[PDB]
Paper text:
The crystal structure of the complex of the deglycosylated human nAChR α9-ECD in complex with the C-terminally amidated α-Ctx RgIA was solved at 2.26-Å resolution. Upon binding, RgIA is buried in the (+) side of α9-ECD and shares a common orientation with other previously determined α-Ctxs bound to AChBPs. Its central helical domain protrudes toward the binding site, while its N- and C-termini are located at the bottom and top of the binding site, respectively. The most profound interactions of RgIA with the (+) side of α9-ECD involve its aspartic residue at position 5 and its arginine residues at positions 7 and 11. RgIA-Asp5 forms a H-bond with loop-C α9-Tyr192, RgIA-Arg7 forms H-bonds with the carbonyl oxygen of loop-C Pro200 and the hydroxyl group of loop-A Tyr95, while RgIA-Arg11 makes a salt bridge with loop-C Glu197. Additionally, RgIA-Pro6 makes van der Waals interactions with the loop-B Trp151. In addition, in the crystal structure of RgIA, an intramolecular salt bridge between Asp5 and Arg7 was observed, also missing from its NMR structure. Instead, the salt bridge between Asp5 and Arg7 of RgIA is most probably induced by its binding to α9-ECD, since this is also apparent in the crystal complex of ImI with AChBP, while lacking from its varying NMR structures. Moreover, since the complex of the monomeric α9-ECD with RgIA superimposed very well with the complexes of the pentameric AChBPs with ImI and other α-Ctxs, this study showed that the (+) side of the α9-ECD alone is adequate to determine the orientation of the bound RgIA. The Ki values for the two α9-ECDs, differing in their glycosylation state, were slightly different, with the deglycosylated α9-ECD (the one co-crystallized with RgIA) having 2.7 ± 0.3 μM, and the glycosylated one having 13.3 ± 1.5 μM.
Numbering used by the authors:
A (entry chain A): 2 to 101, 104 to 213
B (entry chain B): 1 to 13
């Protein structure tokens, strides 16, 4: 019980740096599976071609230093932790049209080192009009996510699902969501550069019929 | 290009 949750926490973080990429061997990669949930479309700005969206970003990865033997902690297999206590993969929206308050979040850390991190985000990003495809009143909005600092040999990002999660979407008045397919892009510069991955969600909006 | 990529960038310098 709570008795042991304190013991485990103390034992886990007695020698733990949230600035060190949590791999045993430094040339091992750290894999991250990313999932985007579209909560709602806050504002689709046609004049400035900017989409403002509410999203939930779910990130999953393994921390090689945050493991424990369950039988040594009264069978405790999971604990909630403020996300800022653990190393975090540093993934941001690349196509931020926004020029610029941070929010406290909690991860769930499992006995085998698996960390799940749900965190909300309010993104602003450019869109391109499409008038060629039916119904010829379309907005294509790309959300591209990737690491701010790490290359793909250090942190590699993978899509959790074929597309964003639209099961909890709030219908917009003027815009219908036609899909949110996701893809992964890995970019290498010149002959020999190390890989640079990102995952891109393509929000396809068609103007609502009324 | 590499030099307009924050993951690369400080490496063209
Ligand atoms: C990372 O993921 C790939 C599969 O996508 C796997 O082949 C590789 O072993 C993984 N590496 C680690 C360190 O988990
Ligand atoms: C949006 O992202 C998709 C997926 O990577 C890409 O193929 C497409 O060209 C992008 N569109 C624009 C306008 O950048």
């Amino acid at each position: 019980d709570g008795k042991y949750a304190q013991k485990l926490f103390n034992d886990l973080f007695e020698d733990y740096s949230n600035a060190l990429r949590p791999v045993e061997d430094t040339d091992k990669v750290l894999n991250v599976t990313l999932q985007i949930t579209l909560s709602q479309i806050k504002d689709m700005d046609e004049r400035n071609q900017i989409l403002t969206a509410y999203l939930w970003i779910r990130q999953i990865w393994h921390d090689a230093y945050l493991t424990w033997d369950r039988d040594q902690y009264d069978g405790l297999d999971s604990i909630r932790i403020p996300s800022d206590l653990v190393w975090r993969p540093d993934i941001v929206l690349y196509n931020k049209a926004d020029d610029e308050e941070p929010v406290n979040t909690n991860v769930v850390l499992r006995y085998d080192g698996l960390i799940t991190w749900d965190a909300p985000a309010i993104t602003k990003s450019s869109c391109v009009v499409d008038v060629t495809y039916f119904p010829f009143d379309n907005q294509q909005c790309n959300l591209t996510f990737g690491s701010w600092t790490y290359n793909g040999n250090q942190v590699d990002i993978f899509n959790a699902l074929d597309s964003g999660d639209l099961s909890d979407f709030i219908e917009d008045v003027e815009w219908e969501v036609h899909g949110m397919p996701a893809v992964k892009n890995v970019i290498s510069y010149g002959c020999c550069s190390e890989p640079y991955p990102d995952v891109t969600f393509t929000l396809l909006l068609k103007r609502r019929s009324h | 290009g590499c030099c307009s990529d924050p993951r690369c960038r400080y490496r063209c310098r």
